[PDB]
Design a protein around this ligand. Structure first.
Ligand SMILES: CNC(=O)c1cccc(Cn2ccc3cc(-c4cn[nH]c4C(F)(F)F)ccc3c2=O)c1
Length: 380
């Protein structure tokens, strides 16, 4: 009965993952001296290779261009050969994830994009694997990200109101699924064909307790955007709530209106120290020319959690005077016209993206390197 459920760990895709993964981890001359291992391989090695050809696989896609990179892989603009549809495909290297003891962040990332069913969340259509990579096949966002937008325009406060509102709604939606994002930044804010925002890169997300809190002893995210409480949790037993995402919205709003990040330093350790000393290090440039309302919202986000705007819920963010505007309302913003509408040449126009510039050793005994990746495959 669970076999049909796309959420169950024992659906057909996961059962096939196990059989495929066992053959992968055993098929070596050394391990084949065990008769058990050889008797199984003989029975199943021909049909597994047949199954491999009929399963969704990488060679079914044309690689048009590489449009993104990360610690463990890259994102490619692809076209599915048979259907001629266009997607963005993210790859995660199995060797690197094992080599750097980081093998479990992709579960929530896959599940959010697959099941959120939200206009604010990039949607996942397929997940598959081969012996080297994980693959997440996603709806393509041809508008680019907000780093690219900020590098090409001087963002007036009217635009900043729009993108900050859309981010607030997107984070609220993620919070209502029980998740804290923890890596809010402009590189994770993607724009669709109509210029509206979606969140991406859910690698550092975490589900909250029945109390709304998370225990964590590890500081995560990006150094420019990390909140004091998350940073402080590296020294043991962090207990914090969703409000760490609102701190990172404050950094984003500063960066859009001022042109630099508010805790900039030449060293990572300097950035870490400035964030700790934020009550003294947060300083707007003399030539800023930023409104009183914008400066008040920025400073209401860039405080300690016990005092931070949003600690009581999103309604206190939405009423803030900075969001007074003559173009949109909180309940209809994504159906109004975005400030920048992309002009697109073809369905593989990638002009809003800058251009971009090892394996396991053969085992002596059973290691099970493919075991952590069982159950990743998903067919919509
Ligand atoms: C631990 N995490 C990693 O190692 C890691 C590996 C690879 C990339 C990243 C960060 N990154 C960058 C771009 C990116 C782009 C899309 C996306 C979806 N639809 N369209 C696009 C478009 F590309 F068009 F913008 C979706 C996710 C990402 C994304 O995650 C992180």
């Amino acid at each position: 009965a669970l076999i049909r459920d796309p959420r169950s760990p024992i659906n057909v895709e996961s059962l096939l993952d196990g059989l495929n993964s066992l053959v992968l981890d055993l098929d070596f001359p050394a391990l084949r001296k065990n008769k058990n291992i050889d008797n199984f391989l003989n029975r199943y090695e021909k049909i597994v290779k047949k199954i491999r050809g009929l399963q969704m696989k990488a060679e079914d896609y044309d690689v048009v261009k590489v449009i993104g990179r990360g610690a463990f892989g890259e994102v490619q603009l692809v076209r599915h050969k048979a259907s001629q549809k266009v997607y963005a495909m993210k790859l995660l290297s199995k060797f690197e994830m094992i080599k750097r003891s980081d093998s479990a962040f992709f579960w929530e990332e896959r599940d959010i994009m697959a099941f959120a069913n939200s206009p604010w969340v990039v949607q996942l259509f397929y997940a598959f694997q081969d012996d080297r990579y994980l693959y997440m096949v996603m709806e393509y966002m041809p508008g680019g990200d907000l780093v690219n937008l900020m590098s090409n325009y001087d963002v007036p406060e009217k635009w900043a109101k729009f993108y900050t509102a859309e981010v607030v709604l997107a984070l609220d939606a993620i919070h209502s699924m029980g998740l804290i994002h923890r890596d809010v930044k402009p590189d994770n804010m993607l724009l669709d064909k109509h210029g509206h925002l979606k969140l991406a890169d859910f690698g550092t997300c975490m589900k909250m307790d029945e109390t709304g809190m998370v225990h964590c002893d590890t500081a995560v995210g990006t150094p420019d955007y990390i909140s004091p409480e998350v940073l402080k949790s590296q020294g043991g037993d962090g207990f914090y709530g969703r409000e760490c995402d609102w701190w990172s919205v404050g950094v984003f709003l500063y960066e859009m209106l001022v042109g630099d990040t508010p805790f900039y330093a030449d060293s990572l350790v300097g950035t870490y120290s400035k964030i700790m000393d934020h009550k003294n290090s947060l300083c707007f440039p003399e030539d800023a020319e930023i409104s009183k309302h914008a400066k008040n919202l920025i400073c209401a986000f860039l405080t300690d959690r016990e005092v931070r705007l949003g600690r009581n819920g999103v309604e206190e963010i939405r009423q803030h005077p900075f969001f007074k505007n003559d173009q949109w309302h909180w309940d209809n913003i994504r159906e109004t016209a975005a400030p920048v509408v992309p002009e697109l040449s073809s369905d593989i126009d990638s002009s809003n993206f800058d251009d971009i510039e090892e394996t396991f050793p053969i085992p002596k005994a059973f290691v099970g390197n493919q075991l952590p990746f069982i159950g990743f495959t998903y067919y919509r």
